[PDB]
Design a protein around this nucleic acid. Structure first.
Ligand SMILES: Nc1ncnc2c1ncn2[C@@H]1O[C@H](COP(=O)(O)OP(=O)(O)O)[C@@H](O)[C@H]1O
Ligand SMILES: Nc1ncnc2c1ncn2[C@@H]1O[C@H](COP(=O)(O)OP(=O)(O)O)[C@@H](O)[C@H]1O
Ligand code: BEF
Ligand code: BEF
Ligand SMILES: [Mg+2]
Ligand SMILES: [Mg+2]
Lengths: 417, 417
RNA sequence: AUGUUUUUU
């Protein structure tokens, strides 16, 4: 008796099971209400019920166990967590809790937690003694997260160009700067697919705030990982809540020496949401940005770091420029002094239908010698010195024509000499 | 005895009928008052009266049935809908209701609804069980909505250029960016005529907010569809109300697997209206735009989506640029990074009296391979690569001179090779 | 109202 197991079951089988259990007509009923009635009827027989979810401690002291399939939205099937157990096990926002639950009695509206069985997918004896995320020693990117497929596919050209322009390692904090209508969607899809193919052990999390739902359901059915999104039909409060829950879960996972990867596509939208939810202080800067509005996105971005004791946190955010709004322009570069990695995309190259439209000149990675060998770094330096004199479109055409001849970049580097 | 039937009748016949029924002199009376008196006299004999309209639920709990011929304006002949029936049939704003009505008794001012016969042009048993619009899975444009006439007319050149620049499919969410005095009116007229000619099965709705009455009555007598407009003589409150009613009706139609097409021509004017009706919060951004003013137009724009279960919602809005106001430059923009189709028009080409004055270079459609075949996409790519080096005016002249030689674009593509 | 917008290189 698990909550996620009943959530994955279809509607027809749940209706059939409820009709066999002998309850009210479930055809004219919601799936969540059907599951609730089935759990009630199964607990009336004396059997136990189990559930799971991410903890969201409220300001009063209690909390609930949000579900991932609903993008951490307030649902009727949330498991109530008393503050006594929180104080007894030192629980915090983001801790994954899995234990026995019971249906609400007369006068209650949510399931109660009796005994916790597993904390953060581990024993509670290992979670009671742990080092906080704020005390971990940061470090630079040491492990190399190669994005090249290696299967010789035609779509691998984007990953090869990305590796030649800006290699990505564990704990990297980069930025994907690109004007609208440049190809950010396809680039993010390719990055997510390459991460899921090359490094399936890492925890991939794609955050899409204030996006077109069709794109949400497309990304959810395309990438092999977790997708937490919030369409534009929701207020900025839900955006802030989702961002906080995601970053808290990422911190709790990193605290257990896990490799978390966050592919953010709405850093600008997140900053707009934070500027909308912040109370007015009577002081407005140039472009309509509050003085204390960028602090929360600043911390959300800076949360990414590489841990020496174990694990890492990678955050790749895509910033929006040339959107016609001065607020986004002020945000983007305020954040430019940030992202230890900038991958610029050119609109002029995208208009020529030359995919990918990557600005190789302005791209780059700091401390790239820690992720590449000596000969590889020398070859990349020679390639950059050869590409720099040529124009952007000409350099992109040259790179595409030279990478189409071979499958691996090593052969291209060997033929360049 | 139908309301719309009496509304379509002329004034002279209604006056004659009222004089034959033996009532007060109807020559010095309004047509609506004449219809009201005729309905009263016909109901005094014991016969039944029927009406219809779009439901507009008020904040208190009751509602009225607005009429389409009055642009959903508050009229004396609105049918009152009690909240009891709303609670009994789960009615919402936008549901088309058609049932028996009765004249108001002593102390009443509006017609009452006794029994509902048809809901959303369908049986109530099919409307009681339905999936909300917020739960439908979005998708990209799959079905091709070809705009080419095919009759070899001289006006078909605009549709041919539009198809070669940006093909339109079901569920598309585009933008027509053009400075003033460019030819937006003729272009919108041609688009509406091509939609009514090629795809007469789709529900066409043209929304004109804050425009001149002459243009309104011109569009109403030119296109073959529904025209809901609101001239500048009305406050922004009526603009917001009309936009809400139109989008709610569109959502209710899409919920019944219908293909709705909305040709918006005032996205900038709608954003200005929303910025005017929003209460001041003491925080003004660059250009005079409120922080929470663009949220409602953002949702109105993002409502457009393609449904996998059935139906679609297409919204083609025309944004205004270079109007001398910085608010529109932020308002029209901020919207640039939202849609997935931009059809730019050049003022320099319009000054040369070269119609249509379309910027073929900056135009385009994302995921265009889902609406065109392989050979068609290759021919469009070759045409774009040939047109790109030439200047805007030169490319437009070349395209016009090459399309004037033949009737179909297939012959042009075959002759280009 | 100052900042924002005006405003840019
Ligand atoms: N690698 C690519 N190959 C082919 N087309 C692409 C590629 N990247 C982008 N595009 C085209 O650009 C359009 C928009 O790209 P997108 O990633 O949505 O840009 P952004 O996210 O910056 O708005 C897509 O619909 C696609 O047709
Ligand atoms: N396809 C066309 N053919 C001929 N003249 C046109 C065409 N499109 C626009 N025009 C001219 O431009 C004028 C204004 O066009 P309009 O569509 O009103 O531009 P906008 O809507 O951008 O203000 C029209 O009065 C018309 O004379
Ligand atoms: F319009 Be893109 F997604 F920035
Ligand atoms: F003056 Be146009 F209608 F934009
Ligand atoms: Mg995008
Ligand atoms: Mg116009």
């Amino acid at each position: 008796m698990n909550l996620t197991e009943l959530k994955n079951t279809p509607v027809s089988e749940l209706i059939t099971l409820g009709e066999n259990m002998g309850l009210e007509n479930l055809a004219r009923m919601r799936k969540q209400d059907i599951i609730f009635a089935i759990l009630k009827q199964h607990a009336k027989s004396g059997e136990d019920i189990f559930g799971d979810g991410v903890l969201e401690i409220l300001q009063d002291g209690f909390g609930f166990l949000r579900s991932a399939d609903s993008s951490y939205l307030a649902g009727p099937d949330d498991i109530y967590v008393s503050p006594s157990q929180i104080r007894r096990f030192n629980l915090r926002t983001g801790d994954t809790i899995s234990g026995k639950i019971r249906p609400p009695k007369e006068g209650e509206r949510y399931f109660a937690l009796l005994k916790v069985n597993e904390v953060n997918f581990d024993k509670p004896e290992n979670a009671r003694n742990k080092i906080l995320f704020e005390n971990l020693t940061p470090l630079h990117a040491n492990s190399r997260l190669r994005m090249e497929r290696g299967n010789g596919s035609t779509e691998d050209l984007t990953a090869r160009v990305l590796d030649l322009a800006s290699p990505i390692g564990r704990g990297q904090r980069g930025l994907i700067v690109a004007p609208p209508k440049a190809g950010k969607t396809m680039l993010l899809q390719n990055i997510a697919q390459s991460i899921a193919y090359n490094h399936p052990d890492c925890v991939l999390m794609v955050l899409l705030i204030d996006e077109r739902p069709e794109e949400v359901t497309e990304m959810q059915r395309l990438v092999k990982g977790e997708v937490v999104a919030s369409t534009f039909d929701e207020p900025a409060s839900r955006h802030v809540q989702v961002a906080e829950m995601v970053i808290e879960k990422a911190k709790r996972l990193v605290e257990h020496k896990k490799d978390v990867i966050i592919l953010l596509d709405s850093i600008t939208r997140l900053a707009r949401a934070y500027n909308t939810v912040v109370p007015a202080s009577g002081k407005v800067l140039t472009g309509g940005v509050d003085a204390n509005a960028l602090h929360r996105p600043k911390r959300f971005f800076g949360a990414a770091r590489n841990v020496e004791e174990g694990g890492s946190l990678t955050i790749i955010a895509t910033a929006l420029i040339d959107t016609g709004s001065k607020m986004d322009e002020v945000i983007y570069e305020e954040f430019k002094g940030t992202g230890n990695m900038e991958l610029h995309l050119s609109r002029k190259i995208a208009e020529k239908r030359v995919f990918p439209a990557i600005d190789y000149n302005r791209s780059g990675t700091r401390k790239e010698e820690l992720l590449t060998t000596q000969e590889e770094l020398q070859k990349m330096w020679i390639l950059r010195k050869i590409i720099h004199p040529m124009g952007e479109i000409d350099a992109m055409e040259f790179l595409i024509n030279k990478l189409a001849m071979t499958k691996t970049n090593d052969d291209f580097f060997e033929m360049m000499k």
